[PDB]
From a paper:
The recently identified bacterial Sir2 domain-containing protein, defense-associated sirtuin 2 (DSR2), recognizes the phage tail tube and depletes NAD+ to abort phage propagation, which is counteracted by the phage-encoded DSR anti-defense 1 (DSAD1), but their molecular mechanisms remain unclear. DSR2 contains an N-terminal Sir2 domain that serves as an NADase effector responsible for NAD+ hydrolysis, a C-terminal domain (CTD) that functions as a sensor for detecting invading phages (as discussed later), and a middle domain (MID) that connects the Sir2 effector and the CTD sensor. DSR2 forms a tetramer with its C-terminal sensor domains (CTDs) in two distinct conformations: CTDclosed or CTDopen. Monomeric, rather than oligomeric, tail tube proteins preferentially bind to CTDclosed and activate Sir2 for NAD+ hydrolysis.
To gain structural insights into how the monomeric rather than the oligomeric phage tail tube proteins activate the NADase activity of DSR2, we first purified the DSR2-tube complex by separate expression of DSR2 and tube proteins, followed by mixing their cell pellets for the subsequent ultrasonication, as coexpression of DSR2 and tail tube proteins are toxic to the bacterial cells. We then determined the cryo-EM structure of the DSR2–tube complex at 3.6-Å resolution, with a DSR2: tail tube ratio of 4:2. To elucidate the preference of phage tail tube proteins for binding to the CTDclosed in protomers 1 and 3, we superimposed the tail tube–bound protomer of the DSR2-tube complex with either protomer 1 containing CTDclosed, or protomer 2 containing CTDopen from the DSR2 apo form. We observed more pronounced conformational changes for CTDopen of protomer 2 that are needed for binding to the tail tube, in contrast to the CTDclosed in protomer 1, suggesting that the pocket in CTDclosed in protomers 1 and 3 is better configured for tail tube binding than in CTDopen in protomers 2 and 4. Loop 1 and loop 2, respectively, inserts into the CTDclosed and MID of protomer 1. The β8 and β2 strands of the tail tube proteins, respectively, forms anti-parallel β-strand interactions with the β strands from the CTDclosed of protomer 1 and MID of protomer 2. In agreement with our in vivo observations, the DSR2–tubeΔLoop1 complex showed a significant drop in its NADase activity relative to the DSR2–tube complex, demonstrating the essential role of loop1 for DSR2 activation.
Numbering used by the authors:
A (entry chain D): 22 to 74, 79 to 298, 303 to 462, 468 to 494, 504 to 629, 645 to 670
B (entry chain F): 8 to 42, 48 to 77, 170 to 176, 191 to 211, 214 to 236
C (entry chain E): 336 to 367, 373 to 399, 406 to 463, 467 to 546, 551 to 562, 579 to 628, 644 to 897, 903 to 1005
């Protein structure tokens, strides 16, 4: 299990994570639970025709002869009375369900996989006959490429005899096409199949017909008691297959198959659903893309790690939803201790300083357990926030070095009020565009909204010509933003998860609710007169406000001017000043806080703070 | 960021270690009409404390299969009892917050003591 | 969004730009077409009207569910009933979960999931089934972590087999992808239920800080949505928080706008359930809630008596259900705290008081907190003689437990059994306790904890018991004299008692002299205030200047250096003291300076009263 099986296992688990995997269920799995296998039936047919009793051609021919000479009724009756025995499912069914397959292709004709699927609760669109493919009620398919008995027990519902296999292409064209396209567009894991099976042979012939590097090599699980020979392994490796053996993996007896199925399948499911080098490689892929964004909200770093570790706004992290290794705890010991971080690979260490450059710039420090005294040092490296109103004009006329600056100068125009030209090159970035494409897309939508509301304000001066107002409406009225995040590459909406809320009009839906609980909590502290010895609920409000403000300004989101954002900023300062006034008569003013009160507060509100 | 040490009154065994977050000393009077004679100085003094992070000792949880709380220069609180109120959230949950109040005995008539 | 359906039940179009179909419908609804559409029209009729949809904008919501009303007994016989249909199973398992019995609900919700083949009920069953699993784990986490600390013993309501069984199934099961993994027909027909798999209305609540009507009415809509639909997430913290923020803000805004609002029986449920003892106490402090009008008092009597019935049945027989305890006890304690402002019948008052005293667990409400709970009920309801008996034998039983030398009643609030006897004596002034006096007649030197306990309840005891108890008692320590003072034994300071106070002052002087500690025994204050009140006539405590505050403030106020004055000092005094402090006139300018600073800095409105009633 050194090299030639670990590659397969990480590939399969990666495909399962993406949702792109399909399990080609064989007949060994269905016969593992007791079920009358085919050769019993064919030898029964022989005993009917002859006195005493097997190659594959005979398997196909004896039922064919019985059908030919004895007719239809007898064959139908014997098949019905031999295949009507209902049986309970086996654990391999619930395992193969728990692996969460997108579609399931089975060459079995028993209603066994579907029963387990219903018991688990997942809903699959069963496909049995020809016509059922058109009336698919879901996007997840349970293909029975050899029919079933659901429509009835009559023989032609399934394929067993020789002529049925001859006329398979012309009798099941749609199902064959579905099988071929599902094999092409997914990854395929063969389970419970003998290496000399006829279906495997035809499928390998078809994949031989295709051109080179036009598919992923499917994975085939073998479980025969004999250890795999090298010769057949080479023969099937060059035949576009990658094969995993349970005989070489463990040792067991020849007459039991449940344990050997369970060993490989449990290894598959349990393995990542270790050492430092894997850890730093693990979080690099999850952290490398975000270098495009200058600032990251700490309350969103949980979503980066699928809510693994809870990030506190003060720079402290406590294990939230980790049941495996403490990978990021290990990373911090690489940060605090240079000795263990020194013993790392060059490429990993070259990765490591990048996050070392990252995690320092976003304020995260260490655990909450290991935390000490933390200073509330927040800097805003955004020119618009500092109000250097001459500078962006200087920053605008300069030629754009790259597309990143093209977005930056585009927002500077929006900061300068000339949103007409700002929109004009906003389409240019979309034309020139890929994370910024999403950022260019929505800001183009937000900037339209401000102008339209501004148009009603003035009319209810002619800043914009009607043709610019005509062109803005044709491209936009069709454009919808709810589907924008879903309408994105699978990698993008999986990699960039913390960017979902910029799409919807309610960009601060969560941030409002979490502040209200603190707000009522803070106003609770007003009357009861209770000191906050620990990190106060009021401080984290300031820390949250500094977190949200930095992201919006540094990353150039048009939400920096919307009334919902302005009201959100205004209501945060109102209570923080309110607490400080009561604390003084039982927080001190700074330049950074001077900007927000001057920028987002109305005149009447300032009187309200003075009055109270 | 005061550290809380909760122990049993009978022994010196640490029940748990926590991080103090809030403390209330909002003492006040009771209803005057319902409660010339010598002055008594009746009051409804109450003290409450709340911690946001807690951690129970391994030995305590192993052996458990009146109290005293001291939080840190450092201040004690004798005869303290917890308020075992629980509420569950739809979001999976993770900061176990523990609130406890100091009892007042009739014989000693004191609730809080602080040493320096 | 074609027709924005506002909360009041009227219709306002918002997005429909084509032909008006809703306009046509209500016109046919109001006026008096094929027969197969007729049954469709009539079927659509009652659904709209029952759901509060009536008509357009141009042209009281009730809940009937056994869980909402607190009917922990009516729904019990429903449990034993054979559930007729699949929907009958759905309400059954939800009902099973409220009275604890989370294991039973897990079984049923599993059965209906495999049973149902509309398919909508399979969704709510799946959501509820996940919620109880999430519920069980949090309870299991509490019991092993906090349940040992709170109750003092490990309960483990669920076997190791069950908890191992449940984790096997909910693993690799997410609530987010459940909605996506449904038949496409189901997704189109049921585009509403994704938000279940609370947060939405909380944001709208912040925007409104009419506003009151549009906030209050939608509150029942949510309650008629979660409770009426057998949705288990109605037992979670976030929904509790939404109710907690909604009602707390509304009364604050209503009182602010008043400076009107009244609440019905349905408004009792949310405040009693989702509000804690701190939320009610904080609500009291910010705004006075006694001005509120309390309609539907008939409904509140049946609720408070019924909830007082449950605790009597629970705690008096076979302990209690730990699973049901956590969910029900919190609702029970707040309701009794609430019941100050309501008027109750004598038979009902005896029911709630008996449960509050006898069958209420000590670990939740100690003798101090149970007393104020009892005292608050006395505000609206005057003391009946039957309740006097309830407090009577309650003290008698307390005297019985005062035999163990380790057992001493301890109260966080600072109130004990003495204040009970004063309260009965307050309303009667002639009550003679036969049972306690009889035990006092059989009182010997052996039960020392008995001697000083009946000392605190001396007026209640008979004259025969008074002589019996006084023979074995003498003024020994400082607490003894205040025990005699509290009952009323001492009305003047005898020369002997002049020696105990000064000797304690020597004791407090002796132990004070390199490391100092700060306590709250408030014994120095009593000595100092007596000199201000001239009850003492000895000028020997002037050498203890600097022992503590509130001592030199009333003995030598002319050099107290009022920089150390605590403004909360005027609160601890009474009407007689405030006049004396104002009439002394040697610090009135100083006190009026400290009285005026708090009225502007804080909105406590009580420093306003002290500023006004005597102008100190």
């Amino acid at each position: 299990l050194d090299n030639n099986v670990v590659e397969c296992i990480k590939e399969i688990t990666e495909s399962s994570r993406n949702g792109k995997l399909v399990f080609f269920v064989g007949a060994g799995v269905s016969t593992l639970s007791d079920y009358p296998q085919w050769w019993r039936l064919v030898d029964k047919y022989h005993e009917e025709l002859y006195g005493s009793p097997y190659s594959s051609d005979e398997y196909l021919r004896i039922p064919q002869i019985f059908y030919n000479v004895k007719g239809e009724m007898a064959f139908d009756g014997i098949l019905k009375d031999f295949f009507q025995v209902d049986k309970p499912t086996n654990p391999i069914h619930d395992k193969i369900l728990a692996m969460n397959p997108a579609h399931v292709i089975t060459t079995n004709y028993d209603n066994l996989i579907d029963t387990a699927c219903w018991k688990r609760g997942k809903y699959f669109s069963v496909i049995s006959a020809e016509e059922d493919v058109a009336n698919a009620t879901s996007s997840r398919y349970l293909l029975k490429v050899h029919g079933d008995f659901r429509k009835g027990f009559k023989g032609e519902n399934v394929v067993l005899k020789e002529d049925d296999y001859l006329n398979y292409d012309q009798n099941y064209p749609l199902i064959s096409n579905l099988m071929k396209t599902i094999i092409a567009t997914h990854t395929i894991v063969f389970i419970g199949y003998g290496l000399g099976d006829y279906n495997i042979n035809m499928l390998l012939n078809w994949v031989r017909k295709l051109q080179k590097d036009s598919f992923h090599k499917p994975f085939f699980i073998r479980t025969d008691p004999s250890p795999i020979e090298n010769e057949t392994l080479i023969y099937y490796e060059n035949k576009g297959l990658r094969i995993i053996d349970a005989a070489s993996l463990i040792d067991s007896n020849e007459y039991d198959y449940l344990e050997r199925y369970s060993a490989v399948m449990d290894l598959l499911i349990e393995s990542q659903e270790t050492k430092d080098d894997e850890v730093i490689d693990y979080i690099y892929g999850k952290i490398s893309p975000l270098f495009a964004l200058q600032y990251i909200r700490k309350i969103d770093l949980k979503h980066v790690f699928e809510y693994d570790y809870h990030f506190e706004v003060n720079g402290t992290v406590v294990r939230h939803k980790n049941k495996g290794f403490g990978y990021m705890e290990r990373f911090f010991e690489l940060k605090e201790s240079c000795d263990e971080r020194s013993k790392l690979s060059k490429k990993q260490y070259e990765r490591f300083n990048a996050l070392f450059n990252f995690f320092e710039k976003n304020g995260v420090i260490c655990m909450a357990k290991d935390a000490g005294t933390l200073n509330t040092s927040i800097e805003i490296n955004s020119l618009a926030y500092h109000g250097k109103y001459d500078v962006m004009k200087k920053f605008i006329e300069e030629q754009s070095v790259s597309i990143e600056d093209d977005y930056k100068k585009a927002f500077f125009l929006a900061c300068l009020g000339r949103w007409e030209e700002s929109y004009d090159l906003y389409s240019n970035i979309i034309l020139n565009s890929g994370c910024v494409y999403y950022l260019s897309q929505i800001n183009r939508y937000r900037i339209y909204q401000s102008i339209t509301q501004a148009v009603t304000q003035f009319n209810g001066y002619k800043p914009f010509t009607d043709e610019f107002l005509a062109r803005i409406e044709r491209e936009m009225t069709n454009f919808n933003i709810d589907d924008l995040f879903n309408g994105m590459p699978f990698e993008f909406q999986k990699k960039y998860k913390i960017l979902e809320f910029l799409s919807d009009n309610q960009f601060l839906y969560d941030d409002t609710v979490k502040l209200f609980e603190l707000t009522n909590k803070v106003r609770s502290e007003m009357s009861e007169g209770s000191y906050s010895f620990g990190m106060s609920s009021d401080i984290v409000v300031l820390l949250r406000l500094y977190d949200n403000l930095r992201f919006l300004y540094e990353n150039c989101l048009w939400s920096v001017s919307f009334h919902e954002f302005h009201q959100y900023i205004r209501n945060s300062m109102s209570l923080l000043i309110e607490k400080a006034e009561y604390e003084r008569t039982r927080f001190f003013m700074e330049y950074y806080d001077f900007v927000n009160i001057s920028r987002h507060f109305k005149i009447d509100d300032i009187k309200n703070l003075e009055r109270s | 960021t005061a550290d809380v040490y909760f122990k049993r009154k009978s022994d010196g065994k640490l029940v748990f270690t926590a991080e103090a977050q809030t403390a209330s000393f909002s003492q006040a009077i009771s209803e005057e009409k319902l409660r010339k004679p010598l002055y008594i100085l009746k009051s409804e003094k109450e003290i409450n404390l709340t911690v946001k992070n807690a951690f129970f000792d391994l030995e305590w949880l192993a052996m458990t299969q009146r109290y005293e709380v001291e939080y840190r220069i450092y201040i004690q609180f004798p005869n303290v009892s917890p308020s075992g109120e629980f509420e569950m959230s739809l979001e999976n949950g993770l900061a176990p917050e523990i609130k406890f109040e100091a009892l007042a005995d009739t014989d000693t008539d004191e609730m809080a003591v602080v040493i320096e | 969004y074609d027709y924005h359906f506002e909360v009041n039940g009227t219709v306002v179009r918002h997005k429909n730009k084509g032909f008006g179909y809703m306009e046509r419908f209500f016109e046919l609804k109001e006026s008096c077409l094929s027969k197969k559409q007729y049954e469709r029209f009539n079927a659509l009729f009652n659904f709209f009207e029952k759901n509060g949809v009536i008509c357009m904008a141009k042209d009281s919501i009730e809940i009937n569910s056994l869980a909402y009303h607190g009917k922990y007994d009516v729904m019990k016989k429903f449990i034993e009933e054979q559930s007729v249909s699949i929907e009958d199973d759905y309400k059954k398992a939800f009902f099973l979960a409220c009275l604890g019995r989370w294991e039973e609900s897990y079984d049923l919700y599993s059965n209906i999931i495999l049973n149902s083949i509309n398919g909508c009920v399979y969704y709510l069953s799946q959501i509820n089934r996940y919620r109880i699993y999430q519920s069980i784990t949090q309870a299991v986490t509490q019991f092993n972590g906090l349940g040992l600390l709170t109750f003092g013993r490990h309960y483990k309501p669920f076997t190791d087999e069950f908890l191992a069984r449940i984790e096997r199934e909910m693993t690799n099961f997410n609530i987010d992808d459940l909605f996506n993994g449904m038949p496409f027909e189901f997704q189109k027909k049921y585009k509403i239920l994704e938000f279940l798999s609370l947060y939405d209305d909380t944001v709208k609540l912040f925007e409104l800080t009419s506003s009151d009507i549009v906030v209050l009415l939608r509150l029942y809509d949510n309650l008629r949505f979660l409770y009426e639909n057998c949705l288990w997430s109605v037992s979670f913290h976030e929904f509790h928080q939404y109710i907690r923020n909604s009602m707390s803000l509304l009364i604050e805004k209503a009182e602010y706008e008043r400076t009107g609002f009244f609440m019905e029986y349905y408004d009792f449920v949310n405040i009693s359930r989702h509000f804690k003892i701190d939320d009610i106490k904080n609500l009291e402090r910010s705004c006075s809630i006694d001005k509120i009008r309390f309609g539907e008092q008939e409904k509140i009597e049946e609720y408070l008596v019924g909830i007082a019935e449950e605790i009597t049945k629970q705690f008096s027989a076979n302990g209690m259900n730990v699973v049901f305890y956590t969910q029900f006890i919190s609702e029970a304690k707040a309701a009794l705290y609430f019941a100050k402002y309501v008027k109750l019948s004598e038979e009902g008052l005896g029911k709630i008081v008996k449960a509050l005293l006898f069958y209420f667990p000590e670990r939740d409400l100690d003798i101090g907190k149970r007393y104020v709970w009892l005292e608050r009920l006395t505000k609206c309801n005057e003391l009946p003689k039957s309740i006097i008996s309830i407090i009577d034998d309650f003290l008698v039983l307390q005297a019985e437990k005062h035999i163990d030398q380790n057992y001493s009643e301890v109260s966080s609030n600072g109130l004990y059994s003495r204040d009970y006897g004063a309260l009965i004596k307050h309303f009667e002034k002639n009550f003679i306790s036969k049972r306690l006096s009889e035990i006092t007649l059989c009182l010997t030197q052996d039960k020392q904890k008995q001697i000083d306990f009946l000392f605190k309840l001396l007026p209640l005891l008979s004259t025969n018991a008074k002589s019996h108890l006084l023979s074995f008692k003498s003024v020994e320590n400082i607490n003894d004299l205040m025990n005699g003072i509290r009952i009323g034994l001492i009305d003047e300071f005898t020369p002997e008692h002049e020696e105990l106070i000064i000797e304690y002052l020597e004791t407090r002087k002796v132990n004070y002299i390199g490391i100092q500690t700060f306590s709250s025994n408030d014994y120095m204050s009593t000595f100092g205030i007596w000199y201000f009140l001239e009850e003492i006539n000895n000028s020997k405590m002037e050498e203890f200047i600097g022992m503590d505050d509130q001592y030199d403030f009333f003995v030598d106020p002319e050099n107290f250096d009022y920089k150390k004055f605590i403004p909360s000092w005027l609160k601890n005094y009474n009407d007689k003291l405030l006049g004396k402090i104002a009439g002394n006139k040697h610090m009135k300018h100083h006190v009026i300076e400290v009285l005026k600073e708090r009225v502007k800095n804080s909105n406590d409105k009580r420093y306003l009263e002290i500023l006004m009633n005597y102008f100190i």
